[PDB]
Design a protein around this ligand. Structure first.
Ligand SMILES: O=C([C@H]1C[C@@H](c2ccccc2)C[NH2+]1)N1Cc2ccccc2C1
Ligand SMILES: [Ca+2]
Ligand code: NA
Ligand SMILES: [Zn+2]
Length: 369
């Protein structure tokens, strides 16, 4: 279906935001990604834009005015004055107050909304925002290191021009904030694959299918530890194909959280970069306007590898396994290769479990008109 025009969103300041000592979320991984893909020469094939800072007006298309006013006002130096408000909005522990928190939100969000605008205007086929994908943020509360739900905001932008928008989430966590925003509408179908069972956020059971007009428009594929490329690949393509057939969206948002990779400091899946990127390849085959977003990922060398390779996939550009020299070269030792190996961990997702969950979701997809 041809090679695609790709617009890529990046602000060079993003890597300077720091969640605090010991916090596993490292915005610097976005800068490592960017530097790696520049050193592969991928800037020659795509348009690179610096996102605007999304305004409080843009954010309150979804989020409450009280919550956004709080995020814009809270700082490490006035936290004592806001103790009550911090608890109301779930800020101060997993979602710390840090210097430049609101600007981080603005840049994360600006990339996603700007990409959606570019898609709406038919000026690109794909838009990429690796600083986006903050799927846990809720209307009036922070959650799981997420403050502003850039994904929901981008989908609201797409809904100006698209009757039906499909959201797909391959982060190891359930995309609960996105699901919740659109749970009672048929104008967005949310599809999340995630680890389920004693695992954050605790949502995304098979049986959560939407409500009201949105009944059957939320799809959740709960998984166990140790899922591998072959097991994931054999459910992802059939599920997404059936979704595309039955729902017929006109735009797609794909959250590419890299915490579903093998060796992730917080995740317990066993995907390689190739296995993760196969999801991008599958979605790309439908030739629909596509917004590719970031997400989790805590082994930062593997995040940079993953999103570099997925940018190359978006561009249909073959890149060598030998990493080019770059500003973070030592982070890619001891091998200095792009691709990763799976671990020897047991896959707790038996082939029968995978088929059975698939069959249950197919029964739900038969309820669409
Ligand atoms: O990986 C996650 C969530 C965050 C989310 C994200 C993406 C991009 C930037 C900020 C945030 C990706 N998925 N986690 C939530 C959570 C909550 C509590 C203990 C560990 C974890 C890990
Ligand atoms: Ca997910
Ligand atoms: Na929905
Ligand atoms: Zn995650």
């Amino acid at each position: 279906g041809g090679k695609k025009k790709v617009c890529y969103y990046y602000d060079g300041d993003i890597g300077n935001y720091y969640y605090g000592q010991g916090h596993p979320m490292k915005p610097h991984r976005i800068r490592m990604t960017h530097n790696l893909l520049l050193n592969y020469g991928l800037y020659r094939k795509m348009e690179i834009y610096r996102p605007h800072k999304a305004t409080a007006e843009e954010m309150t298309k979804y989020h409450s005015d009280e919550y956004i006013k709080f995020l814009r006002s809270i700082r490490p130096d006035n936290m004592s004055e806001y103790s009550k408000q911090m608890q109301r909005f779930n800020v101060g522990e997993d979602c710390p107050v840090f210097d430049g928190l609101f600007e981080f939100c603005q840049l994360s969000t600006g990339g996603s909304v700007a990409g959606a605008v570019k898609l709406n205007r038919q000026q690109t086929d794909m838009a990429v925002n690796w600083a986006g994908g903050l799927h846990h943020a809720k209307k009036s509360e922070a959650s799981g290191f997420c403050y502003v739900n850039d994904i929901v905001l981008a989908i609201l932008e797409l809904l100006k021009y698209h009757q039906r928008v499909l959201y797909i989430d391959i982060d190891i966590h359930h995309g609960d904030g996105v699901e919740e925003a659109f749970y009672t509408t048929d104008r967005v179908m949310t599809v999340s694959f995630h680890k389920y069972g004693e695992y954050f956020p605790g949502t995304g059971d098979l049986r959560d299918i939407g409500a009201g007009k949105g009944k059957y428009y939320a799809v959740n594929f709960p998984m166990r530890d140790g899922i591998d490329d072959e097991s994931y690949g054999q459910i992802f393509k059939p599920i997404i194909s059936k979704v595309m057939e039955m729902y017929q969206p006109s735009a797609v948002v794909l959250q590419c959280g890299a915490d579903s990779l093998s060796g992730d400091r917080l995740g317990c899946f066993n995907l390689t970069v190739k296995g993760h990127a196969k999801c991008v390849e599958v979605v790309k085959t439908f030739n629909l306007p596509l917004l590719m977003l970031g997400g989790g990922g805590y082994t930062i060398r593997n995040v940079a590898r993953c999103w570099t390779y997925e940018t190359a996939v978006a561009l249909d550009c073959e890149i060598p396994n030998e990493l080019p020299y770059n500003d973070y070269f030592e982070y890619f030792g001891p091998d200095f290769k792009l691709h990763i190996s799976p671990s020897n961990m047991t896959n707790q997702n038996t082939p029968e479990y995978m088929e059975k969950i698939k069959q249950r979701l197919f029964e739900n997809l038969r309820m669409l008109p």
